[PDB]
C-alpha cells in the first residue's frame, strides 16, 4: 500500500537546523505535493509547510516562514525540509501527509496533469509515521 | 477522391473541440522582430492547455 516514513527528527536547541527526510512508497512520488504539518504538546494540530508537484511554488506558514525550506526530490521519491534558527515553540511531532490522491475528480472524471502528473489541491487523505 | 482516400486513415480530432485556456506572451526572447507589417502584435503564437482523455 501507500506508505510514508518520516525520519531525521531528534531533540535539537534553537538556533540551529534540522533535515527531515519523508521517504514514499507503493506510487508515484514524481508529481505528489506532499504536506509536512506538526502537532505541539498540548496543542491541536498545525501546517507547516506545501510544496506543489514540480516544486515550482511552496506555502509556508507566517509564523514558520523563513525558518523552513520544503524540497522534493523524484529521483529518491523522497521529500525533505530544512529549518533555520529554531525556536523553543517548535516542539511537535511532525507528520508528512500526502495529496488528495493522484488525479481530480469532477463528475466520475479524473483529470491528471500536464505530462500525466498526480496533482491536486485538497484534503490530505494519507497521513506518514511521524 | 485521392486526398478523401488519404484523409481516411487519418485520426478524428472531435474531442479537441473542448474550451481550452491559452497565454500569448510566453517565455521567450523576441516578439517584435524588426520589420513591422501590421503581423508583430499579431503574433499567432500562444501556448494553450487543454483537457484530452
Ligand atoms: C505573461 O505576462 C503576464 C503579465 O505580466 C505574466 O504574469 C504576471 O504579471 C504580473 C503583473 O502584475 C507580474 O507581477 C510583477 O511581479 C514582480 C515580481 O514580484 C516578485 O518578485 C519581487 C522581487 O523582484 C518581490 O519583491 C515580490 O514580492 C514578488 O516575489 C515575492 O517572492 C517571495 C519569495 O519567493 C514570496 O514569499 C513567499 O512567502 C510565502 C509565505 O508568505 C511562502 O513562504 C513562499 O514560499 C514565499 O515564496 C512573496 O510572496 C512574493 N511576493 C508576492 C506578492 O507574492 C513585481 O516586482 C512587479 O511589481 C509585478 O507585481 C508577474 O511577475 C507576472 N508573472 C511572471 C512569472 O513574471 C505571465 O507570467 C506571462 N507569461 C509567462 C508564461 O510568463
Ligand atoms: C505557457 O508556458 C509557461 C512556461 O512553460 C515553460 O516554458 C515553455 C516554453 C516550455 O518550455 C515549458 O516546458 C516550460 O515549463 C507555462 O508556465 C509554467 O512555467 C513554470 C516555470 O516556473 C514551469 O515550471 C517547471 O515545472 C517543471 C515540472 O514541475 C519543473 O521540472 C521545472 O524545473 C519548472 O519549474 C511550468 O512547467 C510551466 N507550466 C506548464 C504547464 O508547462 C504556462 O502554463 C503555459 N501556458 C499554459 C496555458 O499552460
Ligand atoms: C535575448 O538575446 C540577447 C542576445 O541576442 C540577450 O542579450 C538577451 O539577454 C536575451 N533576452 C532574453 C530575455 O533571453
Ligand atoms: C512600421 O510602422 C511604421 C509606422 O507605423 C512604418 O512607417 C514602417 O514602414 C513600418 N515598417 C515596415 C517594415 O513597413
Known amino acids: 500500500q501507500e506508505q510514508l516514513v518520516e525520519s531525521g527528527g531528534g531533540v535539537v536547541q534553537p538556533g540551529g537546523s534540522l533535515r527531515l527526510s519523508c521517504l514514499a512508497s507503493?506510487?508515484?512520488?514524481?508529481?505528489?505535493?506532499m504536506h509536512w504539518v506538526r502537532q505541539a504538546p498540548g496543542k491541536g494540530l498545525e501546517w507547516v509547510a506545501l510544496?506543489?508537484?514540480?516544486?515550482?511554488?511552496?506555502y509556508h506558514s507566517d509564523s514558520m516562514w523563513g525558518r523552513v525550506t520544503i524540497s522534493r526530490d523524484n529521483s529518491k521519491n523522497t521529500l525533505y525540509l530544512q529549518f533555520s534558527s529554531l525556536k523553543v515553540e517548535d516542539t511537535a511531532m511532525f507528520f508528512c501527509?500526502?495529496?488528495?490522491?493522484?488525479?481530480?475528480?469532477?463528475?466520475?472524471?479524473?483529470?491528471?496533469?500536464?505530462?500525466?502528473?498526480?496533482?491536486?489541491?485538497?484534503?490530505?487523505?494519507?497521513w506518514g509515521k511521524g | 477522391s485521392l486526398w478523401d482516400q488519404s484523409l481516411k486513415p487519418c485520426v478524428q480530432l472531435t474531442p479537441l473541440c473542448v474550451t481550452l485556456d491559452c497565454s500569448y506572451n510566453i517565455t521567450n526572447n523576441i516578439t517584435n522582430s524588426i520589420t513591422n507589417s501590421s503581423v508583430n502584435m499579431r503574433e499567432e503564437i500562444k501556448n494553450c492547455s487543454f483537457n484530452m482523455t
Open positions: 507503493g506510487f508515484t512520488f514524481h508529481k505528489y505535493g
Open positions: 501527509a500526502r495529496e488528495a490522491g493522484g488525479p481530480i475528480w469532477h463528475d466520475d472524471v479524473k483529470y491528471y496533469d500536464f505530462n500525466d502528473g498526480y496533482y491536486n489541491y485538497h484534503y490530505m487523505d494519507v
Open positions: 510544496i506543489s508537484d514540480d516544486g515550482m511554488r511552496k
